[PDB]
Amino acid sequence: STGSATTTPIDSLDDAYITPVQIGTPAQTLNLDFDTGSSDLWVFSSETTASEVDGQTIYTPSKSTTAKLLSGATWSISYGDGSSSSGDVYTDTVSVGGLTVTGQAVESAKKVSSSFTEDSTIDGLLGLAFSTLNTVSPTQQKTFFDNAKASLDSPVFTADLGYHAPGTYNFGFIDTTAYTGSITYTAVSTKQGFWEWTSTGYAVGSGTFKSTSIDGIADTGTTLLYLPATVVSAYWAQVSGAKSSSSVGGYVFPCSATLPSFTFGVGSARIVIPGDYIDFGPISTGSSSCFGGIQSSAGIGINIFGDVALKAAFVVFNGATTPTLGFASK
């Protein structure tokens, strides 16, 4: 089997991407944030505290003939941005882009934090990291991908995120028309439950490539590119007037600037992030100070190849017995 679903930016900054997912019988379609940095599939629901729902579409298990309470199971998750959610668990049929899993754990939110309530476009998350990070207790649950894997033509999914445009998540096949050149594969460590890999270095604009190992995670659920302070300082030093602002919470730059590209290494291959991808616009409405898309990972504890980086590539998440990550230009 295979699946193929279009993913669409939630706003004009590509802050996140939503992908329609069918849950239950008859189908209830919710728009979920596919997150390769976490491992819970959770949704706004008929159980979510009413004051914490503001425009989201909810899953109502009592209207699904295939829903079953997973008795005694609870979940609770906290994300890198400080947001959180928790609740109880149903199993139900879940389909993505024509690919169906029966008995998928669908985590029903009883509580969500403010950031989720305030984002009316995101009806929940679909985690695509390794199932060892799943938060369901006392019986840990599998991700949609892990459940689908044995049925897939090939044990892979691919992320093809657009810049200010829709893109695609495919399951079970590699679309050879979706990228240019060849795919370069690189080793993954699953020790922390992430799609963790080591970049071979970077370049700023037309500058020379610096060979240096940068361990980090491929995380579709993080907007920006978070890298070591040394690397980030070298980038912003090439932008007149750019500075790190503690009041704003990161690097800002004059909105009048033209940003340089940023290149990252994948083995001997190179992925180029155009300068425009690094512009996240005015810090507040009407400001002439703009927020940067490359930020320091210092104090996160991990480097994160978020959407800014991933959208510059066609990315293969290879979930074979020895997992690997592939990157191609597109």
- The CATH number of whichever domain residue 274 belongs to comes to 2.40.70.10
Token pair of 229, please? 């302070």
d(CA 188, CA 194): 9
**Tokens representing residue 253 in the block:** 């730059």
| Domain shared by 190 and 328, yes or no | yes
Return all residues near 292 (Cβ < 8 A) that are at least 6 apart: 236, 242, 250, 251, 252, 253, 278, 279, 280
Main-chain phi, psi angles of 310, to 5 degrees: -65, -35
From 151, 174, 197, give the residue that closes a domain.
174
- Please name which of 136, 21, 123 lies closest in space to residue 88, comparing C-alpha atoms: 136
d(CA 173, CA 2): 7
Number of domains in the chain: 2
Residue 73: partners with Cβ closer than 8 Å, 6 or more residues away: 88, 89, 105, 136, 137, 138, 139, 141
Output DSSP code: residue 255: T
Reduced to 3 states (helix: H, G, I; strand: E, B; else coil), residue 59 is strand
Q: Are residue 217 and residue 151 in the same domain, yes or no?
A: no
The rounded distance, in Å, linking the Cα atoms of 282 and 5 is 32
Taking Cα atoms as reference points, which of 309, 304, 239 lies closest to residue 270? Answer: 309
Total residues belonging to the chain: 330
**Chain centroid to CA 190: how far?**
17
**69 and 117 belong to one structural domain:** yes
CB of 145 closer than 8 Å to CB of 3:
no
Residues 185 and 106 grouped into a single domain: no
3-state secondary structure of 238: coil
The DSSP bridge pattern shows strands 167-171 and 41-43 to be unpaired
Domain endpoint, select from 174, 195, 228? 174
Q: Does residue 82 sit in the same domain as residue 162?
A: yes
Tokens for 43?
Answer: 């949704």
Q: Are residues 143 and 180 in the same domain?
A: no
Placement of tokens 């947001």 in the chain: 83
The candidate with the shortest Cα–Cα distance to 199, out of 330, 321, 309, is 309
Residue 69 shares a structural domain with residue 131: yes
What is the identity of the amino acid at 217?
A: I
Q: Which amino acid is at 103?
A: G
- Phi, psi dihedrals of residue 42, rounded to the nearest 5°: -130, 150
Listed residue (195, 175, 177, 197) closest to 186, CA to CA? 197
**Which residue is listed with tokens 């990315």?**
315
Would you give the end-to-end CA distance of the chain in angstroms? 25
User: Would you please indicate which residues are annotated as catalytic (active-site) residues?
Assistant: 35, 199
Q: Are residues 169 and 184 in the same domain?
A: no
Q: What amino acid is encoded at 91 in this protein?
A: T
The verdict on whether omega for the bond into residue 282 sits within 30 degrees of 0, i.e. cis, is no
Cβ contact 104:91 at 8 Å:
yes
Distance CA 48, CA 306 (A): 29
- Spatial distance between the Cα atoms of 42 and 107, rounded to a whole number of angstroms: 4
* Alpha-carbon span 114 to 118, nearest angstrom: 6
If you search the block for the tokens 């510059």, which residue do you land on?
312
Distance separating alpha carbons of residues 262 and 277, to the nearest angstrom? 10
Range of the domain at 253: 175-330
CA distance 251 to 100: 43
Answer for the pair 201, 212: CB distance below 8 angstroms, yes or no.
yes
Q: Which residues of 236-271 are buried (b: 16+ CB within 10 A; e: fewer)?
A: beebeebebeeeeebbbbeeebebbbbbbbbeebbb
Phi-psi region of 151 (alpha: psi -120 to 50; beta: other; left: phi over 0): alpha
Q: Positive or negative CA dihedral for 195, 7, 101, 121? A: positive
Six-digit token pair at 100?
A: 């169906």
Resolution (A): 1.2
Structure token pair of residue 306: 């978020």
DSSP 154: S
Q: Please give the structure tokens belonging to residue 167.
A: 């893109």
Nearest to 46 by CA among 128, 110, 126, 94: 110
Domain boundary among 127, 148, 174: 174
Nearest to 278 by CA among 247, 303, 242: 242
Residues 12 and 92 in one domain: yes
Question: Is residue 278 domain-shared with residue 323, that is, in the same domain?
Answer: yes
Asked if 127 and 193 sit in the same domain, the reply is no
Helix (H) or strand (E) holding 232: helix 229-236
Residue corresponding to tokens 């980086």? 309
Residue 84's beta-bridge partner residues?
78
**According to the entry, how was the structure determined?**
X-ray
- Same domain, yes or no: 150 and 183: no
Pairing state between β 250-254 and 289-292: antiparallel
